[PDB]
Design a protein around this motif. Sequence first.
Motif, PDB file in Angstrom:
ATOM      1  N   UNK A 180      58.953  67.225  53.523  1.00 21.03           N
ATOM      2  CA  UNK A 180      58.647  68.401  52.722  1.00 21.03           C
ATOM      3  C   UNK A 180      57.912  67.958  51.460  1.00 21.03           C
ATOM      4  N   UNK A 181      56.583  67.940  51.532  1.00 21.68           N
ATOM      5  CA  UNK A 181      55.750  67.549  50.398  1.00 21.68           C
ATOM      6  C   UNK A 181      55.046  68.802  49.885  1.00 21.68           C
ATOM      7  N   UNK A 182      54.789  68.870  48.570  1.00 20.23           N
ATOM      8  CA  UNK A 182      54.129  70.020  47.944  1.00 20.23           C
ATOM      9  C   UNK A 182      52.791  70.377  48.564  1.00 20.23           C
ATOM     10  N   UNK A 183      52.439  71.655  48.469  1.00 19.20           N
ATOM     11  CA  UNK A 183      51.167  72.114  48.992  1.00 19.20           C
ATOM     12  C   UNK A 183      50.068  71.618  48.073  1.00 19.20           C
ATOM     13  N   UNK A 184      48.822  71.762  48.506  1.00 23.20           N
ATOM     14  CA  UNK A 184      47.680  71.298  47.726  1.00 23.20           C
ATOM     15  C   UNK A 184      47.479  72.012  46.388  1.00 23.20           C
ATOM     16  N   UNK A 185      47.721  73.320  46.362  1.00 24.55           N
ATOM     17  CA  UNK A 185      47.540  74.101  45.141  1.00 24.55           C
ATOM     18  C   UNK A 185      48.785  74.166  44.267  1.00 24.55           C
ATOM     19  N   UNK A 186      49.793  73.366  44.598  1.00 26.14           N
ATOM     20  CA  UNK A 186      51.025  73.349  43.821  1.00 26.14           C
ATOM     21  C   UNK A 186      50.845  72.522  42.550  1.00 26.14           C
ATOM     22  N   UNK A 187      51.056  73.154  41.400  1.00 24.76           N
ATOM     23  CA  UNK A 187      50.932  72.471  40.118  1.00 24.76           C
ATOM     24  C   UNK A 187      52.252  71.766  39.813  1.00 24.76           C
ATOM     25  N   UNK A 188      52.180  70.492  39.445  1.00 25.49           N
ATOM     26  CA  UNK A 188      53.385  69.727  39.141  1.00 25.49           C
ATOM     27  C   UNK A 188      53.667  69.687  37.644  1.00 25.49           C
ATOM     28  N   UNK A 189      54.933  69.479  37.291  1.00 25.12           N
ATOM     29  CA  UNK A 189      55.344  69.380  35.892  1.00 25.12           C
ATOM     30  C   UNK A 189      55.724  67.923  35.645  1.00 25.12           C
ATOM     31  N   UNK A 190      56.629  67.680  34.703  1.00 30.41           N
ATOM     32  CA  UNK A 190      57.053  66.315  34.421  1.00 30.41           C
ATOM     33  C   UNK A 190      57.952  65.817  35.554  1.00 30.41           C
ATOM     34  N   UNK A 237      50.437  65.427  51.011  1.00 26.17           N
ATOM     35  CA  UNK A 237      49.738  66.096  52.098  1.00 26.17           C
ATOM     36  C   UNK A 237      48.250  65.817  51.954  1.00 26.17           C
ATOM     37  N   UNK A 238      47.655  65.245  52.996  1.00 21.18           N
ATOM     38  CA  UNK A 238      46.229  64.930  52.995  1.00 21.18           C
ATOM     39  C   UNK A 238      45.842  64.255  54.306  1.00 21.18           C
ATOM     40  N   UNK A 281      53.356  59.507  44.248  1.00 22.20           N
ATOM     41  CA  UNK A 281      53.824  58.645  45.339  1.00 22.20           C
ATOM     42  C   UNK A 281      53.784  57.136  45.068  1.00 22.20           C
ATOM     43  N   UNK A 282      53.558  56.743  43.817  1.00 26.45           N
ATOM     44  CA  UNK A 282      53.505  55.322  43.469  1.00 26.45           C
ATOM     45  C   UNK A 282      54.752  54.600  43.958  1.00 26.45           C
ATOM     46  N   UNK A 283      55.905  55.159  43.620  1.00 26.22           N
ATOM     47  CA  UNK A 283      57.179  54.595  44.032  1.00 26.22           C
ATOM     48  C   UNK A 283      57.625  55.423  45.231  1.00 26.22           C
ATOM     49  N   UNK A 284      57.873  54.745  46.345  1.00 25.74           N
ATOM     50  CA  UNK A 284      58.255  55.399  47.590  1.00 25.74           C
ATOM     51  C   UNK A 284      59.533  56.250  47.564  1.00 25.74           C
ATOM     52  N   UNK A 285      59.526  57.301  48.376  1.00 27.11           N
ATOM     53  CA  UNK A 285      60.652  58.215  48.513  1.00 27.11           C
ATOM     54  C   UNK A 285      60.845  58.465  50.005  1.00 27.11           C
ATOM     55  N   UNK A 286      62.001  58.073  50.525  1.00 27.97           N
ATOM     56  CA  UNK A 286      62.288  58.249  51.946  1.00 27.97           C
ATOM     57  C   UNK A 286      63.683  58.858  52.144  1.00 27.97           C
ATOM     58  N   UNK A 287      63.821  59.741  53.125  1.00 29.44           N
ATOM     59  CA  UNK A 287      65.124  60.331  53.387  1.00 29.44           C
ATOM     60  C   UNK A 287      65.699  59.661  54.631  1.00 29.44           C
TER      61      UNK A 287
END
Lengths: 219, 103, 103, 106, 106
Positions: free
Chosen positions: A129-139, A218-219, A194-200
């Motif tokens: 579950x990764x954010x959509x392309x038009x999703x604006x991120x915060x801190x 997503x890309x 994604x610099x530091x990996x995240x895996x479930x």
Amino acid sequence: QVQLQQPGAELVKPGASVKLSCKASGYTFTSDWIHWVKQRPGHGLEWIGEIIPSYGRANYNEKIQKKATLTADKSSSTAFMQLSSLTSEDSAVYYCARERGDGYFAVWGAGTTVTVSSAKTTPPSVYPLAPGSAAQTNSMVTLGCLVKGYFPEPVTVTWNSGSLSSGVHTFPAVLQSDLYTLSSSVTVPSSSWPSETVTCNVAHPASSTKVDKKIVPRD
Amino acid sequence: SALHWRAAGAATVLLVIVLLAGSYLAVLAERGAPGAQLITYPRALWWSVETATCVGYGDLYPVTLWGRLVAVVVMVAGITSFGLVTAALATWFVGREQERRGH
Amino acid sequence: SALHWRAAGAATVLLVIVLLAGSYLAVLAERGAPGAQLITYPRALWWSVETATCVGYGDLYPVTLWGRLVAVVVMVAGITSFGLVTAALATWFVGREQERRGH
Amino acid sequence: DILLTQSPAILSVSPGERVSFSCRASQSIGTDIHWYQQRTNGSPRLLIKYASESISGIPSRFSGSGSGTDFTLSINSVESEDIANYYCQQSNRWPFTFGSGTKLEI
Amino acid sequence: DILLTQSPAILSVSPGERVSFSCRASQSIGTDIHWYQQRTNGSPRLLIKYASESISGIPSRFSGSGSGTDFTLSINSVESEDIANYYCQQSNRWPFTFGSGTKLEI
Ligand SMILES: CCCCCCCCCO
Ligand SMILES: CCCCCCCCCO
């Protein structure tokens, strides 16, 4: 180190029987009693019985229908509970606990989830579950993983092999047509992914499967 | 060491053994009996001592056949043991007095 | 077999007899008294033993005149019997010590 | 069999406030009451034994009191990690029994 | 004299379900409670002795529990032959006394 080890789950067909195990480690005294407690979803703790391995004597709760038979193996330090001719009423988490003969349960096992059903075991499909392309991120950025179509419960979801505990929500499963589905959520500083990996990591004890799923943009 | 003193010591060690086994066995016999209170080792040991000395406060006691049988052994072992110490003391005084009488 | 050992044995058999008759008679005396608990043979036998040893937990006891009279007999028989064993042990030690002293 | 009554079933408190859980036994049981904490999907965890004796590893804000038929589990200054279900259990008479449990809400 | 309260006086259950009869003593009587079954025009019949001890000849679906002042007679999966009146009786103190009885309806 874990004093009492119990299998995560057991699927049982109505009418059939199952033998739960409880392998103990750590200090062992002739005065030790291994207890079994039943906990149905949403309910409290119900005492089933006890056994003193040093002697092999077992006592049971007289208020409920006797479904269990307790035995113990001194050589392998394991206590067993035979549940027989189960029905959906026997579906619950069964904990084993150790008492030093002084009245309180100093240590409990992780518990074995027993599900009495006719359905078949089914490992889970894990999707990212990764954010959509038009999703604006915060801190901070929120990621997750979908654990769909599994049976029976439960599944254990961890992030980065357990090293990522803060910012994690794993929603209760939902049952639909003999299959469970849930999602787990993790939130980390937007600058770290994604610099530091995240895996479930998803473990489904009922089918002896543990699968990983890396979350990438997503890309 | 004269016999009576040796028997006294032996009686004492044996009583200690009876107390420990009695405490262990009482719990084993009583658990499983709805209402029983003689079910944890620490207080069972205390129960064994107050039984061996026949004080019997009544704070704890067996409700089952086997718990009661275990209690009887503890009672008899205590009575016998302390009774044996008394007999040893008597022998000691009898011996000393025979000497003091020049016999 | 010396006298004291014979008397000890006899005292023991007699105590057993007193316990059984005491248990039987206590029930007979107590039934009919509203509130009495010493009314069934199994626990009455247990009551008789804890009375003979004078432990007296207080879990059971007679409330009637005759139940109490029966209790007194059991108490005295127990005290006397165990007391007699003590006296036998003393005699045994006194004899052994007299030998060891070359008298 | 000893009935352990835990009421109310749910306790709501503001962060930092002192909270108290009640456990009432159907008959006198001295101090033979023990308290356990069970978080969502976790196994029960011993907090207090014999009504007031502390366990190592358990925060100091946790304490228990009472004797006879009435017991209390207290948390001094509750925080988020305290959110869970709390159960009392008796070991005075056979069989051991558990209370119905009280949930802590903040 | 020990009063034995059996309430409710009538119990209705669907075939196959588990049913429980209550017996409450006016004072503590340990486990000295016994249960009897009396069918229409029949004489009483011993089902359970000393609260939980089974009797030979009695179906396994019959069990009892409790101690102190509260006792329970349970029937696992009730069937037509279980239709009858059920009485508890105490033998802890003189005189022996009987509860008022509970009828089982299916
Ligand atoms: C003196 C021998 C005592 C044996 C105790 C055994 C207890 C078994 C209980 O069911
Ligand atoms: C020592 C003699 C005891 C006789 C017991 C008789 C009991 C009669 C009760 O009415």
